Motif scaffolding. Structure first.
Motif, short mmCIF file in Angstrom:
data_model
loop_
_atom_site.label_atom_id
_atom_site.label_comp_id
_atom_site.label_asym_id
_atom_site.label_seq_id
_atom_site.Cartn_x
_atom_site.Cartn_y
_atom_site.Cartn_z
N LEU A 137 0.84 -1.19 0.00
CA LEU A 137 0.00 0.00 0.00
C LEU A 137 0.88 1.25 0.00
O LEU A 137 1.54 1.55 1.00
CB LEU A 137 -0.94 0.01 1.21
CG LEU A 137 -1.97 -1.12 1.37
CD1 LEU A 137 -2.77 -0.93 2.67
CD2 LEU A 137 -2.90 -1.19 0.18
N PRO A 138 0.87 1.98 -1.13
CA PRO A 138 1.77 3.13 -1.35
C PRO A 138 1.43 4.37 -0.52
O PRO A 138 0.25 4.69 -0.31
CB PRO A 138 1.58 3.42 -2.85
CG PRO A 138 0.18 2.99 -3.13
CD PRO A 138 -0.04 1.76 -2.27
N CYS A 139 2.46 5.05 -0.03
CA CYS A 139 2.28 6.30 0.69
C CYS A 139 3.59 7.08 0.71
O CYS A 139 4.62 6.56 1.15
CB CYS A 139 1.78 6.07 2.11
SG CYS A 139 1.23 7.60 2.91
N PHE A 140 3.53 8.32 0.24
CA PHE A 140 4.71 9.18 0.16
C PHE A 140 4.41 10.58 0.69
O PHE A 140 3.25 11.02 0.74
CB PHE A 140 5.19 9.33 -1.28
CG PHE A 140 5.49 8.02 -1.98
CD1 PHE A 140 4.46 7.28 -2.57
CD2 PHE A 140 6.79 7.55 -2.07
CE1 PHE A 140 4.74 6.08 -3.23
CE2 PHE A 140 7.06 6.35 -2.73
CZ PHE A 140 6.04 5.62 -3.32
N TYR A 141 5.47 11.30 1.04
CA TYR A 141 5.40 12.72 1.38
C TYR A 141 6.76 13.34 1.09
O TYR A 141 7.75 12.63 0.88
CB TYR A 141 5.00 12.92 2.86
CG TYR A 141 6.08 12.52 3.84
CD1 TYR A 141 6.31 11.19 4.14
CD2 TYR A 141 6.88 13.48 4.45
CE1 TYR A 141 7.31 10.83 5.02
CE2 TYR A 141 7.87 13.12 5.34
CZ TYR A 141 8.08 11.80 5.62
OH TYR A 141 9.07 11.43 6.50
N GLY B 229 11.10 9.71 2.49
CA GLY B 229 9.70 9.98 2.23
C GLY B 229 8.83 8.83 1.74
O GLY B 229 7.65 9.02 1.49
N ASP B 230 9.41 7.64 1.58
CA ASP B 230 8.62 6.48 1.18
C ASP B 230 8.15 5.72 2.42
O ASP B 230 8.83 4.84 2.93
CB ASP B 230 9.42 5.55 0.25
CG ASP B 230 8.59 4.37 -0.24
OD1 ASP B 230 7.42 4.23 0.15
OD2 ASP B 230 9.13 3.54 -1.02
N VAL B 231 6.96 6.07 2.89
CA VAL B 231 6.37 5.35 4.02
C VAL B 231 5.31 4.34 3.56
O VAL B 231 4.31 4.11 4.24
CB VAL B 231 5.84 6.34 5.08
CG1 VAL B 231 7.00 7.15 5.64
CG2 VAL B 231 4.79 7.26 4.48
N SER B 232 5.54 3.74 2.39
CA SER B 232 4.63 2.71 1.88
C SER B 232 4.57 1.48 2.81
O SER B 232 5.61 0.98 3.27
CB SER B 232 5.02 2.28 0.46
OG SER B 232 4.95 3.39 -0.44
#
Ligand code: NA
Length: 109
Positions: free
Chosen positions: A15-19, A70-73
């Motif tokens: 499950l992808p999540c970035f900031y 920043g890759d908190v996937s």
């Protein structure tokens, strides 16, 4: 229709999540939880990168990405039917006034 992520029972779920991190390379941390993002937090916590986190090394919830960058996937290993549903990935940089909220829909069959 609307954005979906899928896995079969037994597989890993990704499950992808970035900031965008604003250095100095410090953990501007994530709240990963079960359920659509509520107003303040991230739902039933599944992985929270702070001092309240417990038993990381034994849980099925992994941040295997470059998270300082920043890759908190999320990767959930060995998924079951119960793992289906909506996940909240919330970035509270305090820091910035506007939180980054992401709902990610996981389907397991
Ligand atoms: Na884990």
């Amino acid at each position: 229709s609307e954005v979906e992520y899928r896995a079969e029972v037994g597989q890993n779920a990704y499950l992808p999540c970035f900031y965008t991190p604003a250095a100095p390379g410090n953990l501007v941390p994530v709240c990963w939880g079960k359920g659509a993002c509520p107003v303040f937090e991230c739902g039933n916590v599944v992985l929270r990168t702070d001092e309240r986190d417990v038993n990381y090394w034994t849980s099925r919830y992994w941040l295997n990405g470059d998270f300082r960058k920043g890759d908190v996937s999320l990767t959930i290993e060995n998924v079951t039917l119960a793992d289906s549903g909506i996940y909240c990935c919330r970035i509270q940089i305090p820091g910035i006034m506007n939180d980054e909220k992401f709902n990610l829909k996981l389907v397991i069959k």
